[PDB]
Amino acid sequence: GHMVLKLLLELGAERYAEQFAAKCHELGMVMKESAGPGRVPVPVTLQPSMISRGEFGTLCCMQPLWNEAVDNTARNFTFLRDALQETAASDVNFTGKLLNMLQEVYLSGGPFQQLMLGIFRTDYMREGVTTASRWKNVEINTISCSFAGLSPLITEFHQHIAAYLQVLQKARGKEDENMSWIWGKGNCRLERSVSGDVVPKAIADAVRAWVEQQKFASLRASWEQFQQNLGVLDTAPVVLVVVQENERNTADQYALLMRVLEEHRIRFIFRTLQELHLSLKLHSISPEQPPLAVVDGHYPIAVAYFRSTYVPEDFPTDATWAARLSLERSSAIKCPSIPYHLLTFKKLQQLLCDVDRVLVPVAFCGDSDKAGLLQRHFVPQYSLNPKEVGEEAVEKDVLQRPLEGGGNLLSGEYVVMSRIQFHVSTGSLLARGDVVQLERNMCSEVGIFGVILSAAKGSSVGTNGSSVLFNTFAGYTVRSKPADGVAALDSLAVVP
Amino acid sequence: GHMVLKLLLELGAERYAEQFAAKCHELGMVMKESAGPGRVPVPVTLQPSMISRGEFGTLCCMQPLWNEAVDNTARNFTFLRDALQETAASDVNFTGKLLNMLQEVYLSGGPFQQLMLGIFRTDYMREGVSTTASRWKNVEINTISCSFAGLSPLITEFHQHIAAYLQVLQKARGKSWIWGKGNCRLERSVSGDVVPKAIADAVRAWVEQQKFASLRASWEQFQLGVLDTAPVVLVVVQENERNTADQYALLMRVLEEHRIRFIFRTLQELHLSLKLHSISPEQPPLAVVDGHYPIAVAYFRSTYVPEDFPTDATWAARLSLERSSAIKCPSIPYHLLTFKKLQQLLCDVDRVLVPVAFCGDSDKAGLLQRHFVPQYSLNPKEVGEEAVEKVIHDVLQRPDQYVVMSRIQFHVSTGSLLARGDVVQLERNMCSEVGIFGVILSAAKGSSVGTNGSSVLFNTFAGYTVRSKPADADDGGVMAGVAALDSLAVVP
Numbered sequence: 001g002h003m004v005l006k007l008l009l010e011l012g013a014e015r016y017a018e019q020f021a022a023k024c025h026e027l028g029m030v031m032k033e034s035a036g037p038g039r040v041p042v043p044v045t046l047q048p049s050m051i052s053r054g055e056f057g058t059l060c061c062m063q064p065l066w067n068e069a070v071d072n073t074a075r076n077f078t079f080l081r082d083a084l085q086e087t088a089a090s091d092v093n094f095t096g097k098l099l100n101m102l103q104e105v106y107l108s109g110g111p112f113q114q115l116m117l118g119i120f121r122t123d124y125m126r127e128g129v130t131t132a133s134r135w136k137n138v139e140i141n142t143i144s145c146s147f148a149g150l151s152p153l154i155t156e157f158h159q160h161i162a163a164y165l166q167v168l169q170k171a172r173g174k175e176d177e178n179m180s181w182i183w184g185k186g187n188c189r190l191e192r193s194v195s196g197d198v199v200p201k202a203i204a205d206a207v208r209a210w211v212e213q214q215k216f217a218s219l220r221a222s223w224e225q226f227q228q229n230l231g232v233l234d235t236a237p238v239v240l241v242v243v244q245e246n247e248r249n250t251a252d253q254y255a256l257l258m259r260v261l262e263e264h265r266i267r268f269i270f271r272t273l274q275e276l277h278l279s280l281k282l283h284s285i286s287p288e289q290p291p292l293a294v295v296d297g298h299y300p301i302a303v304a305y306f307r308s309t310y311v312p313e314d315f316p317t318d319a320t321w322a323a324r325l326s327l328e329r330s331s332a333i334k335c336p337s338i339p340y341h342l343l344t345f346k347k348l349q350q351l352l353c354d355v356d357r358v359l360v361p362v363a364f365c366g367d368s369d370k371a372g373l374l375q376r377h378f379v380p381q382y383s384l385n386p387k388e389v390g391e392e393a394v395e396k397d398v399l400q401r402p403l404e405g406g407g408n409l410l411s412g413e414y415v416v417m418s419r420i421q422f423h424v425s426t427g428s429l430l431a432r433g434d435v436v437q438l439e440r441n442m443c444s445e446v447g448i449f450g451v452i453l454s455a456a457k458g459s460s461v462g463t464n465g466s467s468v469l470f471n472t473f474a475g476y477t478v479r480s481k482p483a484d485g486v487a488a489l490d491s492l493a494v495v496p
Numbered sequence: 497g498h499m500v501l502k503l504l505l506e507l508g509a510e511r512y513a514e515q516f517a518a519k520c521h522e523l524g525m526v527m528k529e530s531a532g533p534g535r536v537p538v539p540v541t542l543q544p545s546m547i548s549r550g551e552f553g554t555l556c557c558m559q560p561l562w563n564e565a566v567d568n569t570a571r572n573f574t575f576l577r578d579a580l581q582e583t584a585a586s587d588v589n590f591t592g593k594l595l596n597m598l599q600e601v602y603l604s605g606g607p608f609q610q611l612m613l614g615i616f617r618t619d620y621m622r623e624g625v626s627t628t629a630s631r632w633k634n635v636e637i638n639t640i641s642c643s644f645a646g647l648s649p650l651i652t653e654f655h656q657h658i659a660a661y662l663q664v665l666q667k668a669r670g671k672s673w674i675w676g677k678g679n680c681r682l683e684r685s686v687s688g689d690v691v692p693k694a695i696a697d698a699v700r701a702w703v704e705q706q707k708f709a710s711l712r713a714s715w716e717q718f719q720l721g722v723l724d725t726a727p728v729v730l731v732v733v734q735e736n737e738r739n740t741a742d743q744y745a746l747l748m749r750v751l752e753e754h755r756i757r758f759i760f761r762t763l764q765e766l767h768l769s770l771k772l773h774s775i776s777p778e779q780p781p782l783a784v785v786d787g788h789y790p791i792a793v794a795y796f797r798s799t800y801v802p803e804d805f806p807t808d809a810t811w812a813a814r815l816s817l818e819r820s821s822a823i824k825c826p827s828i829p830y831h832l833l834t835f836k837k838l839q840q841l842l843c844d845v846d847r848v849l850v851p852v853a854f855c856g857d858s859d860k861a862g863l864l865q866r867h868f869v870p871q872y873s874l875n876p877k878e879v880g881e882e883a884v885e886k887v888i889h890d891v892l893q894r895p896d897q898y899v900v901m902s903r904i905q906f907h908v909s910t911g912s913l914l915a916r917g918d919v920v921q922l923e924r925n926m927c928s929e930v931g932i933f934g935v936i937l938s939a940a941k942g943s944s945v946g947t948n949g950s951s952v953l954f955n956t957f958a959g960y961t962v963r964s965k966p967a968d969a970d971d972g973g974v975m976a977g978v979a980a981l982d983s984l985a986v987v988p
């Protein structure tokens with residue numbers, strides 16, 4: 001994984017890093033330096049990650065099954081409450097207050113917007129060096145998933161090294177190990193993430209789907225009949241992007257949000273939960289339906305797209321929870337709904353491992369057929385609290401069960417897990433555009449994105465009496481982070 | 497003209513400065529801070545500048561005459577020398593040393609690389625007052641390190657964002673270039689494309705003239721080490737560049753599209769990195785850098801100001817380049833047409849424009865001659881009295897830079913811009929300066945290489961850029977930190 005950096009130096013390029021910072025700026029792969037304005041480049045790898053056509057294909061093909069698992073589970077509210085009550089009684093001020101909302105909104109008789117937009121990412125890591133997959137699933141996340149916007153840019157940056165290197169080689173010369181991603185045609189090709197286009201369109205199509213549900217034109221016509229006597233309704237609704245009080249990953253959200261505006265013609269406005277305390281008002285128009293959420297007494301909110309609320313600190317006040325509840329209570333298709341949010345919790349990525357009490361019945365409704373395909377990428381997990389055979393699982397061979405605990409420290413004795421040595425390598429990486437760091441024991445984490453928009457279990461809502469309006473692979477990103485501290489963005493070159 | 501910032505405030509636009517900064521970074525329209533690595537958006541206007549298709553037409557079509565007029569005067573070495581001698585006597589430590597290179601390389605009978613590559617930009621400004629004249633007057637001719645050929649087309653894309661944004665905002669409550677209607681259309685510059693191709697073709701022309709593979713072969717026959725398979729564009733860069741965006745915007749296309757390598761060096765660097773290797777004493781010597789880089793083109797993004805020549809080392813390096821085979825952009829004789837004196841001499845027609853710069857084509861001279869602000873000559877080699885006698889009939893409209901000029905009242909319009917992270921409204925206080933780029937590649941004055949027996953390999957209009965500025969503002973450009981970039985929108 002140091003071949004690029006080695007070829008560069010040994011082909012007499014000494015000023016490569018300037019260039020690579022310049023290409024970074026062209027594509028707009030950047031981040032604010034701590035001192036005031038003035039953005040500098042993101043941390044990026046000098047080489048892409050290698051991946052079989054087949055293995056890549058498998059990960060892409062399975063995202064719908066993932067999304068579905070999450071939808072099915074998330075909408076199983078009784079299950080969520082029951083299957084998480086102990087984590088709630090433990091973390092009251094966050095995990096608890098989130099479980100309360102599930103209840104007040106979805107589990108009392110109260111009405112609620114049943115459409116939900118998922119923009120998830122499933123993160124796999126490859127197994128080191130059974131018909132199970134080498135790529136084990138290490139992380140599932142449904143809330144403010146990062147890089148769906150930045151990710152494609154990385155491929156264009158890697159295309160640049162490939163070009164530069166081609167000309168540099170020819171210039172000595174020697175194309176003769178070709179590491180064939182450099183010579184674009186066939187055997188190996190840098191695969192551009194489709195997520196910069198698919199995710200803006202999901203958001204787009206969710207706003208559209210909200211408009212059509214509500215008959216927003218008629219909502220206005222009705223609205224106005226009450227004012228035929230203080231603040232008119234906008235003529236289209238908007239995406240409310242909920243941001244943290246200290247916002248980061250900005251380039252990324254713009255790359256997304258700019259496409260929603262320019263390509264799909266829908267306004268995005270940025271709010272903190274705090275700010276919505278005083279901006280957001282619910283407005284009932286039919287008692288038996290979730291209220292319309294106007295912001296500033298004119299913004300109709302079609303989608304509440306969270307780029308926040310995932311960690312406790314974005315809830316520094318009751319007001320913040322008041323505002324967070326207000327949206328959920330509303331009619332905006334949320335991303336994530338609380339249900340979807342609660343499916344990020346590690347406690348459920350564990351539960352999903354139970355392939356017979358949770359995976360098949362709850363998250364696939366008995367389609368053990370489908371369930372069995374996800375299974376391939378599993379790492380067994382095993383709880384520690386009540387159920388008498390939480391001792392038979394501990395009495396079970398050989399120092400291979402997890403910073404984390406493992407080996408001599410774990411031995412001295414939170415949840416059991418099957419130990420997998422993940423594939424590690426050393427990698428050229430470029431930080432701030434001017435420090436080339438040679439990282440060591442660099443893992444690569446491939447994250448395959450999914451977009452889903454679904455209705456109630458059992459509705460007709462989405463065609464072929466589905467209830468799913470759409471469910472699809474949504475591109476990918478790759479993060480290179482050390483096993484054991486900040487990742488670089490990387491990208492896939494697929495070989496067959 | 498006011499409209500944009502009023503439409504935003506009115507339509508309830510919100511965080512628009514940040515969105516707009518976002519779009520810049522995303523489009524790669526940026527500028528280095530004075531403090532190291534960080535980059536911030538360029539100053540840009542929140543609306544395009546308007547021009548009629550017919551005037552914009554004539555401006556484009558004039559550019560090849562401009563390139564031609566510059567090519568010829570430049571190549572009339574003895575004329576060029578005589579012209580600048582008083583202006584060199586006044587300033588010996590810059591103009592003098594430059595004029596000395598002309599003397600050395602081109603006049604005293606050495607060999608020199610005869611092929612020359614011009615990346616120019618004639619700027620105009622519309623007067624605000626019959627078609628005996630154009631309404632657009634030429635203000636500066638630029639032949640050394642012309643800026644914005646790379647970034648200009650991004651400015652259209654930025655403005656295109658604003659127009660998209662304003663449609664959506666208008667639509668959202670009830671409800672001109674904002675709409676692509678077709679009777680007013682934002683035209684994106686082609687300078688980002690035509691210029692790289694120009695540098696590409698220049699390398700190609702050098703590669704052919706030298707018959708390089710033939711040359712590379714000889715080298716192995718005649719310590720001297722393995723010489724690269726292909727030459728490079730050498731970009732001679734200022735010691736502390738901020739405008740790296742423009743530079744790379746162009747150069748990356750040379751690499752990625754035209755498969756040709758660029759390398760950046762200061763002069764100071766080149767003094768160590770660059771030696772010359774004579775093959776025949778009748779041809780100018782090859783220039784290799786770092787032992788292996790063959791220099792085919794010496795593009796200069798530096799050298800226009802004295803501050804880039806701190807050391808005699810630096811002038812040395814500059815001569816080495818000049819003496820070399822490399823096609824220069826500019827060559828010294830091109831460089832010297834940037835000077836204010838040549839611009840002032842190109843004014844009188846019978847004496848310099850027709851016989852020098854167009855070789856007795858009065859017709860061509862008469863086209864360019866439609867965009868002139870008459871400059872006359874006080875402190876004269878002639879009697880120079882019958883302009884001074886003329887003036888005090890109608891005395892109220894002639895300034896001087898030393899040299900009597902005619903007093904054009906240049907058009908003032910209204911606009912808003914985003915500079916230094918603030919949104920600036922300029923009410924009836926903004927003048928714009930339309931910059932037509934041009935490229936040229938030519939041989940010796942009577943040679944054959946080039947199209948239809950002419951010494952000219954190519955000569956096109958190369959797109960355009962627009963710069964706007966407060967009218968009450970202090971002298972000069974975007975780099976000076978007083979002007980913003982801008983974009984034309986063309987109206988039938």
Ligand SMILES: N[C@@H](CCC(=O)N[C@@H](CS)C(=O)NCC(=O)O)C(=O)O
Pocket residue numbers: 141143144145146147244247248249250252306307308310479
């Ligand atoms: N405020 C940031 C937060 C993004 C973030 O770092 N969140 C997590 C998901 S909850 C992520 O996918 N990136 C970090 C990681 O890989 O864990 C944003 O909206 O982009």
Ligand SMILES: N[C@@H](CCC(=O)N[C@@H](CS)C(=O)NCC(=O)O)C(=O)O
Pocket residue numbers: 638640641642643644734737739742743797798800963972973974975976979
């Ligand atoms: N060294 C910088 C700046 C070169 C420069 O100052 N160019 C001048 C002409 S010599 C220009 O086009 N004017 C800057 C302006 O008008 O704002 C670069 O290569 O971009």
